[PDB]
Write a protein that binds this ligand. Sequence first.
Ligand SMILES: C[n+]1cn([C@@H]2O[C@H](COP(=O)(O)OP(=O)(O)OP(=O)(O)OC[C@H]3O[C@@H](n4cnc5c(N)ncnc54)[C@H](O)[C@@H]3O)[C@@H](O)[C@H]2O)c2nc(N)[nH]c(=O)c21
Ligand SMILES: [Mg+2]
Lengths: 19, 737, 146
Amino acid sequence: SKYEAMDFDSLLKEAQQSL
Amino acid sequence: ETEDHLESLICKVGEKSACSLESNLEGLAGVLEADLPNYKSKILRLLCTVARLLPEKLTIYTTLVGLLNARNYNFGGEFVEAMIRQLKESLKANNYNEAVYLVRFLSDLVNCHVIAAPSMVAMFENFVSVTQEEDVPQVRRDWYVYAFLSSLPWVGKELYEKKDAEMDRIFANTESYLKRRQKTHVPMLQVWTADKPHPQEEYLDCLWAQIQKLKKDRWQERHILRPYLAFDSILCEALQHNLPPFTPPPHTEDSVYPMPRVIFRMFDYTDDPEGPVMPGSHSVERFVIEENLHCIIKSHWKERKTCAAQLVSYPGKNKIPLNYHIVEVIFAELFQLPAPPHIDVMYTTLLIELCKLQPGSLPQVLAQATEMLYMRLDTMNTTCVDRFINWFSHHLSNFQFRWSWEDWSDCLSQDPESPKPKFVREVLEKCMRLSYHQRILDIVPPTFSALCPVNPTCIYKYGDESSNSLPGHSVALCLAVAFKSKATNDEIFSILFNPLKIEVFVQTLLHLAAKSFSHSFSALAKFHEVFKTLAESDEGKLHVLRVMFEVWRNHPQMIAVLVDKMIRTQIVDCAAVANWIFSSELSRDFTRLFVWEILHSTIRKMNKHVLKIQKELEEAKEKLARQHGVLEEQIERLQEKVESAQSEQKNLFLVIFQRFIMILTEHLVRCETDGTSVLTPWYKNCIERLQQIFLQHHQIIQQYMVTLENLLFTAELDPHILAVFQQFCALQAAENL
Amino acid sequence: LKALRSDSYVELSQYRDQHFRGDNEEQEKLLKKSCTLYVGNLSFYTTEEQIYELFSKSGDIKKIIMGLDKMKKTACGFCFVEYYSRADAENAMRYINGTRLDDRIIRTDWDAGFKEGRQYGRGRSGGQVRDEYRQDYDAGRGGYGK
Ligand SMILES: C[n+]1cn([C@@H]2O[C@H](COP(=O)(O)OP(=O)(O)OP(=O)(O)OC[C@H]3O[C@@H](n4cnc5c(N)ncnc54)[C@H](O)[C@@H]3O)[C@@H](O)[C@H]2O)c2nc(N)[nH]c(=O)c21
Ligand SMILES: [Mg+2]
């Protein structure tokens, strides 16, 4: 549930920068 | 791991964020392309989950699917095939509320250029084609028409400009069907029977008027959020997919369709003059707004705090008096007939959470709505008045029992049995049940003491003031000592159908245990054997209830719990309670609320009892058939005790309807002789409590049709009584031939 | 979806009964199939009748056990509520928890089930331990906290 409790911007911006 | 990163990233798109909704969708669609080579299988079922479970965010996810399709044609086809697959799964499993969300999703995909409009028109004229099916329930035809009409707010403009020759054939078939529907049942489902200020319209007639006005408006509607319009350039070059020809799953006997509905309406634009203008009742904006708010509750009902935040953060593409829409949707569910979507207490705590989150706006909208409901009580459905009473009292108990009672001072001048003064009386009784008698005398103005409840103290027949000349006074004093001596059962037997033995025994036992419910339940359990002995006769059971009432008539809460306990411990039975509700000793309290709470609580016990033993039989039948002699012998004994429980169920309803028909007719002759009007306030409550029986348990009563029609509700009865029964027949007729 | 299946009011709290006979694993097992709720932060004057009226709104109540002071044997400011079905207790957990009774915010917690001796406060003075370390003055809670 580490991802589950995050903000949308945090997740979207982490996906496209990392890989 | 990265799957979890994909899921939470799909579910949270379109929430509050620094970036725009379009920027978030374009970005998210880009990362779903990258991950698609490896995770095509998982990305596919996640998008199928949100299309099924998140209809409030519909247009957000259709756009997303629209972007992926423009860039990947084979993904678009796999997704549409999965939707067709799921739409058939849902219709087969009788999940029609879930199927409309899928149809609506397929329809909006046409705006995203994923599905070709002709394919969608073909499917819809097969939907309306269900109106031509013969020997099928009206509710089946209704749903397929509803799935078509309720999708048009999103896909209406596109389907009409592309193909308007075949759309008008559909509309012509639709209008023909709507005019020949039977609306005899609507009155049982209306929260108010009055047409003013707001008519409570049958849901399909309402939707139809809404769609036709949208048509005259050139299919321009200004609420639905359409993110795909910013991606026109990207989505114009996309390749469309053709839906296969759709065949509605045939009507079987196991088919269960959604029952008819009435649109709850209590607000127009004049109720919020300063603020965003409110969409009219015949605008599709009102339909989409309420449908979405209902869906937000359906998704988040289990979490009151989250549910409120999602309602408050509801986005539109134009401003709307949102607080008024929220309150109206919440009350639409609390007053929905026959039953609300969710447990009633959920709506009380959801409104408090909303008050915490909008303390400067919502509390006064809520209060404005409470005044409106009060002022329209005259024609409010009695099942809804009950829920209004239970909510308002529970709400007040969370806000210090603070209310401007002076605003309602005009009920003090009316007949005490009129709807407004009866409402206030019931409210204050409920507030006492949550607090205590003196608290309620202090918080109400001194002018409201006539509507306050009597102080809840038992009445002992053989107390000090009692005369020694009373029959059994001597024995009553012997019992009073033996009870405090911890005497056993047989000793009490020696100290004692005989009415006096019950009277002295019950009077003394209840009097000595009156301190609390725990002591009373302990007393019944300790001397349970005694009750079963002298109360085995049916008339004995009746006399236990009669005496128990004489002691606690001023404490309605104690009566309900004692009746509940005596049923569960088999001291009395449900037929005794039914006959007790209609006895002469309760005639003065007959119209009061707690009486019908007891009766309905007894019915629910019977109904729950039958279901338990039917599941046993419907399990042993599974073991025999699934596994495959000795089991068939066990089935024969289950069926015997399914029939015996089903006949006691039927007898409970036949008693109620008999006593109802008797007290109503003899009131109709008493009015004919005296030469006076038939509509007494008492009469209104009685006839509406009869309708409540039919409405609450319509699914069980459906089994008694021929008995009811042929033996009870016949030509000989007064037209006023038959009117109620014919409404109930119209209802069950809409879902069964 | 994880969000829609979420029941954050029904999940267990950090409280565990130390007098419970067993280890943590089997107590948590009992909690997740329990129909009994612990009700805390009650006024000393709150009656069994008031608790019946409030807690019935989520289902039928099988039994209510008022918590007492082990010495004075008087209302201790808490009780237990046993439902017939667990769905009813779950609904009391979602919608009745955190609302008012006698104008006090009450807190409900899952309980392992009632056994003799649980009705008495485990505080050194006979009341609840909660009221031993209390500093503020509370009228419904019996004055100061020692
Ligand atoms: C609080 N509580 C009490 N009971 C039950 O009520 C009855 C009486 O029990 P009790 O309240 O008198 O004492 P308890 O067993 O709870 O002991 P506990 O140590 O857990 O109490 C904790 C409280 O003590 C106070 N406290 C103790 N030490 C400190 C400290 N250093 N600092 C601050 N506060 C402290 C605090 O108020 C703290 O919240 C028992 O049967 C008990 O199972 C509960 N049951 C469930 N299912 N969930 C509960 O939360 C619960
Ligand atoms: Mg019959």
